[PDB]
Structures are given as C-alpha cells and as structure tokens.
Assembly symmetry: D2
Homo-oligomer: 248 residues x 4
Amino acid sequence: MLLEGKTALVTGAGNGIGRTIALTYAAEGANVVVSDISDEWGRETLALIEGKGGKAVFQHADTAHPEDHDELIAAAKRAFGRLDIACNNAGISGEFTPTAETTDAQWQRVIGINLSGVFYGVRAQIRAMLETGGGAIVNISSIAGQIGIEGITPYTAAKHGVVGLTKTVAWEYGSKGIRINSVGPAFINTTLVQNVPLETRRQLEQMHALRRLGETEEVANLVAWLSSDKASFVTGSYYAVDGGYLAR
Amino acid sequence: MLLEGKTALVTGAGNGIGRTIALTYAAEGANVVVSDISDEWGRETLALIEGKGGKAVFQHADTAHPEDHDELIAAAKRAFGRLDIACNNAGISGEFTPTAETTDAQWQRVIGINLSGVFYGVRAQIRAMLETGGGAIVNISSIAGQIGIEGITPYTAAKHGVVGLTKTVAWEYGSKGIRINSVGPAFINTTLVQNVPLETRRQLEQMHALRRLGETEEVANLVAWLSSDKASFVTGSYYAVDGGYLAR
Amino acid sequence: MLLEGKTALVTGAGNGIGRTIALTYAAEGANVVVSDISDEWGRETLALIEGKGGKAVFQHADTAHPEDHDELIAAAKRAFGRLDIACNNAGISGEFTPTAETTDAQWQRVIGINLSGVFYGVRAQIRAMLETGGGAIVNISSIAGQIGIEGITPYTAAKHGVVGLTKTVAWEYGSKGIRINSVGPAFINTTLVQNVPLETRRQLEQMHALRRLGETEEVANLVAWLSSDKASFVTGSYYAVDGGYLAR
Amino acid sequence: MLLEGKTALVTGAGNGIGRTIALTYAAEGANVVVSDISDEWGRETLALIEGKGGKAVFQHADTAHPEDHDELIAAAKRAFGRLDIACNNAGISGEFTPTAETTDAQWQRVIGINLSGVFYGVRAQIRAMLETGGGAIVNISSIAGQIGIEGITPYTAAKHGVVGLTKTVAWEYGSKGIRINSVGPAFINTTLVQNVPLETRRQLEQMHALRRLGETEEVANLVAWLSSDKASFVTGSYYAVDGGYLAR
Ligand SMILES: [Mg+2]
Ligand SMILES: [Mg+2]
C-alpha cells in the first residue's frame, strides 16, 4: 500500500477521474474525505469505498464557493484528525465555442470551477497541512495546461493557470513540508468522451502516441503515487498522463 | 517604419511598459488608441504621442468590465476607421502575499485584470479585426507565465492563463487572418520597480543572465516587431524578453 | 511488488543513481542485468542485489560503443530469456568549464556517453523488446535537459537531446507496445556531490523548493513506477524529480 | 536598417534559410561573412549580396570540423575588423528512418553537423566577440528542438541539444555582453519540402495554425531582429517561427 494511515481529500469525486482517484486512494490504505457538488454521486462514491472495506466520509462542497472549502477541512479533522493529502480535481471543459462567440457566463463559470476553485482549495489545504507537519497536494490540470485546444479558451486558460499556481505554492511552502504537483491527463475514457461518435473518438485516439484513450485508473495511479511518500522529492512539477499527446 | 498606416489599440497604456508600447507603436507609424483605467495617465501617454507628431486618441476603459471593450473598438473605428493591431498589456501583480494568506479580493482583482480583462479584450478585438481582414494581437504575459514567483499566486495563475488562451486563439483564427502571440518580460525598470532598495534590485538583477533589469523600450521593440508584417509566420507563441531569467 | 517477473537492464548501474535504480528494480521483483563501464563497480551492485536474494547478472559494456549494446541484450536473453524494461542511466557532467574553454575531447566524451550511448542503448532495446511484445524504457535526463547549468554545456546539450529522442521514439513505437519516458533529477546526494563544501551544498540546496538535495532512492522510486504497468498511459514525457528546481 | 555597421557571419549560407539570412543581414546594413561547405553555392550567395550593393566575403567551412571555425573568425577580423553577429544555421534532417533502423552513420552525421558543428561555432564566436565587447549569436534550432518528429530521432536530439547549449552560454556570457538565442522554424518552403507531393505538403500545412508553410524571409526577419540592438534584453531564449505548430 502506498498511502497506509494517511487522510486524503478528493474534490469532484462523484464521477469520472475524481471517483477513481478516491477509490484508489482508499485501496492504497488512505482514509478518504469524498467531496462533490452532487450529494447523490458523492455518496455513491463513498458507498463504493465502504463496500470494499475502506474508511471514508462524504462532505458536500461547491468548490467555486470559498466558504465550502473550510467545511471540507473541518470534515477531515473531525473524521480523521488531520489532512495529509489533497486532490483538487474539477470541472469539465464546457461547450466547444470559438473565442469570439464565447459568452461572459461561459468564461466565468469555467474559470470559477477550474481555476478559482483550485486556488480556494489549495489555500484551505495549505492552512490545514501546516498544522500537522505538511503533506501533499495534487492539482488535476490537463494537456490543456500545456497546449491549446480549439473551442475551449476558458478551460485552456484555467488549466494553464493551475500549472502556474502549482509552481508558486511549491516554492512558498517547500520549506514547510508541503509538496504540490499538477497532473495532465489527455483524453480519458469517461462519460463525455464515451458519448461521441466512433469517428471522433478515433480522431482523438490518433492524437496520442499509444493510439487509444486513457482509462481513469491510469490517471489515478499517478495521482496516488504523487500523493505518497515515494514521491518525496517531487514538487512544483507537471506530470503528464497523456499517452504521448504533448510529444508531437 | 514597421507599422505605417496601421491602427493599434494598447490597454494599460497609461504608464510603464504599456506607455512605451503605445509610443513605440506611434513612432513606427501606427495610429494609436490609448487606453487605461486611469484617464489622467492615459491622457498623459496621449500627450507624449501627440507631442512627437503622432496620431492618437484616448478612450477610458475598465478592462475588467466586458462592456467597456466595446467602447475601445468603437473609439478605434470612430477616430481611425478600423482596428489592425491590439496589445493587451493589463496590469501589475499586486502585493506579495503567501497563498494561505491571499484574500478572495486579491485573487479576484488580479484574475479580473490580468486574465479575464485579456480574454474580454481578445474577444472584442477578434470580432473587430474579422470585419476588415484580420490583424495582429500581442498579449503581454510575464516570466510569471512560465515559472512561479513567490507571493504572487494570483498573478502567476493569470499570466499562465494568458499564455494558454494565446495558443487556442491562434488555432481558432489562424486561417482567418489573425496572428496572436504572448510576450514574457522579466523584471523591467518601471517607476514601481525603480523605488525598491539597491539591495533588492541587485537581487532581482542577479536573476537575469544579463545581470541587469530590462528597459520598457526593450519590451516595446519586441511588441512592435510582433505586431508587424515582418512577423507574418509567428503565431501562437511565447516570446521572452527576460534577459535570460528562464534559462536557469 | 511493482515489477514481479519482469527482466530489467540498467546502464551506469555501478554507483549513484544507477546503482539504486538497479537495487530498487530487484526489490520490486525484477530480474536485473547490471551494466557499467566499470566492472568492479558493476560487480558490486550485483553483489548488493544478490545479498538481498535478488536475481541479477553483470555484463560489461562501454555504452559509448554501439556494438557493446548487443552484448547487454544478449546477457539479458542468456540469463533471464527476454528484456522487459531498460533504464539508460548514463553518466556525469564532467568538470565545470566555460564554453569558450571547453575542449573537443570534453565535448566528444560527454556527448558520447550521455547522448550517443543513450541512442545506441534505446536502439538495441527497442529491437529486443519488439521480439517479445514490447516493454518500457526510462532515460535518465536531468534538470539540465530543461534549463542550462553554467560550465556544463556539453552535458546540457546531451541531456536536452535525451528529452528529444524520448519524444520521437514514443510516437514511433507507441502502437507497437513500447513506452519510453525521461526522468529529470536535480542535485542528488551521491558520493560525488557529498564531498563538495557545506557552503556549496548549501548553495545547491537553496536552488530547490524543498531546500535540500534529493536521495538516490527518491529518483529510483519514480523510475520503478514509470517502468511498471501502473504507468500504462505514460509515454513520451519528462518526469522531474527535482525538488522544485525548475519551478522558479 | 537594423544592423548598420555590424559584421555578421552565417553558416550554411549557400542555400535555403541560411542564404536568406545572409541576404537579409546585408539588406539591413551588415557586412557579411558568408560560409558554406559548398564553395559554388556560397560564392553565389556572396554574388547575390554584392549585386545589391552589400559588403561581404566568402569563406569555406565544414562546420563539423573544429579547425574550420578558426578560419571563419579569421576571415571576419581580416575583412571587417570584428565579429558582431553570428548565425549557426545548419544541416538537414537526414532521411526519415525509424529509430530501430537508424544506422551509426546517420546518427553520427546528423549529430556532427546539427549539434557538434553548432558547439564548435559558438565556442569560436564567443572567443572572437569577447575581444571586441560582445555581440549576438543566433542558433537555428527547429520545432524539433521542442517536439518530436517521427523518423528523425538524430535531428530531434540534435535540435533539442541546440536549445540547451543556448541556455548555458547565455548565463556564462551574459555579464560580458554576449546574447545568444535559438530560433525554431517549422516547415519552411525550401528545396526539400518543394519536392514532395501536394497531398504531403497539405498534410504539413495542416500542422500549422496558419495552414501554410513558412517562407525563408519570415525566418530571416526574426533572425535579423534577434541579431540587432532592438533585441538587447533578449537572451537564453527560444523564438519560434512556426506558424503555430507547437501551440496544439
Ligand atoms: Mg503538439
Ligand atoms: Mg528557473
């Protein structure tokens, strides 16, 4: 086990990559504070964990609301005594819309969830970890944190911004035992990409060196490693899980 | 003359890098729409342009307000008939504050000006330029768009976000006559920077391979070149003007 | 056990990072072909592996000689029957010498070992792995594959070259069952580094966000993970183990 | 004029991007030392320059031979008194060959010309510039200095290596007034790409945001700017001229 005895929080854990991250953290021996804006999906992730003999609680949060992060910290300390690990996993892309046609609401919503929500989490997490001797934070960025993808200017800006805030936090808090890294998935086999046409999926697949999409466990495995004491010299860094996407 | 007969917009043109960009645009023959949140400062840059025989007007805009960008486009159209070039110069980093102590207001203000304001500007500028055959946009990022600087998490996030949205927009509009690139200054001898102790400047200087700080004209020269038809194969890219800061 | 039943080759395995990589591979259950230019050092690493109950052999190779790579493949095939994993660990930077004073012999030696030797190894390893269904290759680069370090132009060139050839090979062989990635250590507490003055180490330490040097096990842990089936969506990519060095 | 009164050397100047660089340097007012391994092509470039009223000489060099660089320096000092500017422009890709099939001679030849030849030039140039108060060096890298291109492992490694050696030289010599930068062209309309099929050229074109190939003047214009006093805060940096290639 990678994470025996450690307490981990995961945001956006009711579905997709966040759900797998939560399940993997618990399989690696972590106590997990599952969070999602959906109570139904969040509680289902919790039930998944408990059904496999893991230790977890569910706490609702809208990560775009600063105040909800304090409730997350509170839940961790109350259930498990300390926060060792946090994963800021978040929103989706939004709809594909050219920049000239992108509305204020699209820009604001994507920025809110995928960038501001990460800052608010990271700020609360740091505070908590500083009390119990440090810890490890992983921010889920994207390949869109390194390259651009047409139609999703807001997400690209957000995901780049996550890569940046990882860098400055690493230097601000490295002395004090907080590691922080970003993870950059490419296209992963989750709901949204499952609903598009075989032709479009083949097109996406062909943008990867491995010529397939990734699985959520392939991302989670990385996240779990970066969250572990095996990663103790790893901070301020972007870790792709991109099947070679960025390499061409 | 790199820019004879062109019409350029410069945001944050009231002082520092943005003032010099505006002057250098006029010196290279462009008509200039001077913008700034401060009307007094914006009017001053206009006065310096006009003093040398340049053609310019001033138009107030709060670039954090989406609607004010329409007034800038309109001013360009009213004074000179079209928009050929835009430089989104944006602002400053705010006070150095570690992430765990950075307030909601700090985060929201710096994001709003240095990231959202650039998106609202790029959006408006694309729309305008598409009416008359295209043009060139230069976004001023920072070294902070590529590395972290302790104490300015919000600015680092924003400036990384700027590098990302440049990439997307370049692919979205590359066939439609629009080039867009980002510029990454390091520490530049502005009035703000001038006042810090010879010791602290000696510390900033030593972070550059040239072992000095840059001048605003060294930034503006690059911006002018990137805005010109000499740069006709240059798009989607980040151009440091950093005296070697990123190279170590 | 990340690597049960796998057979791994490690070059430059006689000491430092390469010795620890080899041990950690054996500890994770792989058979290990130990290689090094120094037979005494290579035999020592073999002895430490065998002492713990690991399965290993030693095979001399000068990795700068293309033909010696054939002897390494053959040793893997003779002792364990196939090659599943290879780590091209390569060497050291040589003496710090400014570019204008760097000799032909310095340039040619460092390029030969740290760049050409990696290409000859990757070439041989690809050929071998293609015979039995594929495998995983990890190239040890450096922070010097992403930034410059004064006095080691040849090493900087080589280590950047390693990051590049990783990218190409990943696309060339990604459909044929081969993953390849690069690892970028910063300054690591090897015997070489251990002997430098507490002052000079304090200067190297301060260049890392963790404000210390790394341990060879912190590098090897990453290498082992990247060599394993947990890393099944990871290819073409650079994975720092740099304690935050690149983040400023 | 950008370069009035300055003396510039260009390598690989008998054809393609190097020839255009030479012609542009001379149009910008520089005295030019044209160099190529082909005397015939080299002398034709010289005649082009002289026919437009420029000042230049031709000096043969094989840039893979260290000794030939001393002859280049000697020619500059003898004809024009000093070296202000140098452009290390070089070889070609070689044949497209998968890594497992690439021979020792292919790896050695491409590395020799595109990497070692750049180091040997840079080493000689530094020495010369240090005598007359510094200057500016531009290294022609490629998009292959940032990404991988299947079939050209040697060129990818070489072009990455050029990006790296630019970084360390910038820091070693920034104090002493030497600027050094790399330029990264994408696919440019030169002989080799002119001879491939419309279908293949359309495929290449489609890898650029501008959806066309670049022209040699678009590259030279950049090189000339980076070689000029307008670029005085620009060093250690990679400047794409890639039509947006790297941005996706
Ligand atoms: Mg790409
Ligand atoms: Mg740095």
